[PDB]
């Protein structure tokens, strides 16, 4: 697809068998989702954001649908103001701005 | 030109008379630069995301030269660890994200 922005680029995510909503978000590094539970074992992150520093939980090696393409990859678990999708997997799914 | 996601988008910007960097940031509203001074009337604003808020002062009617595509647009000026260029600023350069 060719997504032009006036609107917030939201698209369906699929994660653990439940659809959510995210912001394709080419200004973050990471991926950062609302609380969840995931499987596995799961690391400590600081991410700074515009507000200031958090916590959240890193979780590696995801399996994750964004906009019908999958995706295998680091999911960070915290309090977002929306569920982001940062570069990580942007690169995944073949993501490049164009103007 | 065609960006890679692979790294932070970054680009140079012309504003206030002054060159900056600033990341193309599909997942901003509105355009946020670091401290500096603008002409004109502005009015306070609170913006939030990762770790909350900050307050920052909204002007109004800025030109901004982005990439060399000039635009204008609502700038908002604060305490932004970096400089973003938001949606409101990306759809006058025609930018899109594809995959
Ligand atoms: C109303 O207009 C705005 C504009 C911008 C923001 S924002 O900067 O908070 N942001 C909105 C998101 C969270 C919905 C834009 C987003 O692209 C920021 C933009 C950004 C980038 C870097 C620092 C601050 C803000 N990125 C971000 O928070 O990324 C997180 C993942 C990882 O990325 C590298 C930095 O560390 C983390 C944070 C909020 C309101
Ligand atoms: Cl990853
Ligand atoms: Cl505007
Ligand atoms: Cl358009
Ligand atoms: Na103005």
Redesign the pocket.
């Known amino acids: 697809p060719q997504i032009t922005l006036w609107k917030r680029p939201l698209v369906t995510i699929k994660i653990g068998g439940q659809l959510k909503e995210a912001?394709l978000?080419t200004?973050?590094?990471?991926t950062?989702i609302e609380e969840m539970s995931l499987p596995g074992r799961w690391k400590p992150k600081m991410?700074?954001?515009?507000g200031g520093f958090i916590k959240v939980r890193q979780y590696d090696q995801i399996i994750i649908e964004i906009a019908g393409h999958k995706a295998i990859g680091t999911v960070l678990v915290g309090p977002?103001?929306?569920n982001?999708i940062?570069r990580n997997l942007l690169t995944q799914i073949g993501a490049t701005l164009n103007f």
């Open positions: 912001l978000d200004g973050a590094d990471d950062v991410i700074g954001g515009i977002t103001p929306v982001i940062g």
